[PDB]
Design a protein around this ligand. Sequence first.
Ligand code: Y1J
Length: 119
Amino acid sequence: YDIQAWKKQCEELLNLIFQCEDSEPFRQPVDLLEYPDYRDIIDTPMDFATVRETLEAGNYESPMELCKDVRLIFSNSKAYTPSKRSRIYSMSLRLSAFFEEHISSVLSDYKSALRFHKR
Ligand SMILES: O=C(NCC1CC1)N1CCN(C(=O)c2ccco2)CC1
């Protein structure tokens, strides 16, 4: 019922995501010299370095907020991709599955801890 445990759990999950070759495209912002139209399509850029920095700054209040920003990485890839069979989009789907498989217990435990705190 540790209300704070989600933060280190998310740090370790981000470490695992940074070890995944599938995170390569999502570790830093999109360069506009490489993708000049990116911001015509994507209103809110997001990447895993930004998520990690936000977490380490103490600027997430809950793992739900972190989850929303991670899910934005993946929705941005789905919105930007010209094809559902693109390399970078295909990498996003595997990384998303990995992320969802691991974040589920982090969210469940946090929400359970908060309920216990308010019992
Ligand atoms: O340049 C990127 N990353 C930073 C570079 C890797 C170090 N991008 C990742 C996001 N992105 C897509 O999701 C996408 C879908 C289809 C094609 O690209 C655009 C390219």
